[PDB]
């Protein structure tokens, strides 16, 4: 009956979005406007590692779904969505996003694209290749 199982303390700013990793549901990532997306585990209040996924705060975090896909995405108000590989820890590529602050960005699972939205009222689809 919605008791507080665990409290996660790690983020030092406004936690815009949370997503659960589909390869370990015990793991989730949270995006905060603190220019990181921190990968946390349930067991651990603290984020067990930090990724510095964006440069003007992270609105969103998403995983690219699947049993063999360790990916993060960060969206930021620097107009840009960035793709990261959580396995290698590098930034795979930067996506132009929109011509104005990228509100959110997400990965489509089946199709190779990223769908992003912006406060300019525009949504863009980018080929992920």
């Amino acid at each position: 009956k919605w008791s507080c199982s665990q409290v996660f303390e790690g983020h030092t700013h406004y936690v815009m979005q949370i997503v659960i990793n589909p390869k370990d549901n015990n793991q989730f990532a949270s995006a905060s406007l603190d220019r990181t997306i921190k990968v946390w585990q349930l067991g651990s209040s603290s984020p067990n590692f930090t990724l510095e996924g964006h440069e003007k705060g992270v609105n969103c975090i998403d995983y690219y779904s699947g049993g063999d896909k360790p990916y993060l995405i960060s969206g930021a108000d620097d107009r840009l969505v960035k793709i990261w590989d959580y396995q290698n820890k590098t930034c795979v590529q930067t996506l132009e996003g929109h011509a104005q602050n990228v509100s959110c960005a997400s990965f489509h699972p089946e199709l190779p694209i990223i769908i992003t939205g912006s406060e300019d009222g525009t949504v863009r689809i980018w080929h992920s290749s």
Binding site: N21, K23, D24, Q41, G43, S44, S46, P47, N48, F49
Partner: protein
């Protein structure tokens, strides 16, 4: 201080190491290889070599023996089928000349699981009482909570 941490696959060796280094519980993959990291505890810098426990890699530990001041042997306390195998690996490890004076610390791990064997039980099964030639200690641990980990680093530092 130079530390070699080994044990069968899935005992929790990398979980232990990155709990110690990052205060975080990471999502491991089987280690085909080693991880090597430096950890600070109470003015000691422990260089820990976590060497994968699956068979192919197990065959390679002997290259990490030399220069080892202390050995962490991680055991999955919940796995009763493989305890004999652990005993066999560890016994001949004890016969290794490069490991001759190294401090021997057993971690009975996943103590958090309901049917985990106790540290005493594990001590009997691994034959720890029969080591008279060097320092040994057994410590119940849970690498996910962090329980027993620093008690281990403590014991080790008192070599």
């Amino acid at each position: 201080m130079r530390i070699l941490m080994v044990g069968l696959d899935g005992a929790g060796k990398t979980t232990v190491l990155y709990k110690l280094k990052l205060g975080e519980v990471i999502t491991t993959i089987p280690t085909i290889g080693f991880n090597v990291e430096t950890v600070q505890y109470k003015n000691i810098s422990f260089t820990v070599w976590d060497v994968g426990g699956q068979d192919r890699i197990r065959s390679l530990w002997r290259h990490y023996y030399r220069n080892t001041e202390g050995v962490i042997f991680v055991v999955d306390s919940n796995d009763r089928s493989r305890i004999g195998e652990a005993r066999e690996v560890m016994q001949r490890m004890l016969n290794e000349d490069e490991l001759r004076n190294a401090a021997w610390l057993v971690f009975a791990n996943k103590q958090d699981l309901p049917e985990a064997m106790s540290a005493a039980e594990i001590t009997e099964k691994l034959g720890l009482h029969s080591i008279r030639n060097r320092p040994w200690f057994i410590q119940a641990t849970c690498a996910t909570s962090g329980e027993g980990l620093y008690e281990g680093l403590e014991w080790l530092s008192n070599s």
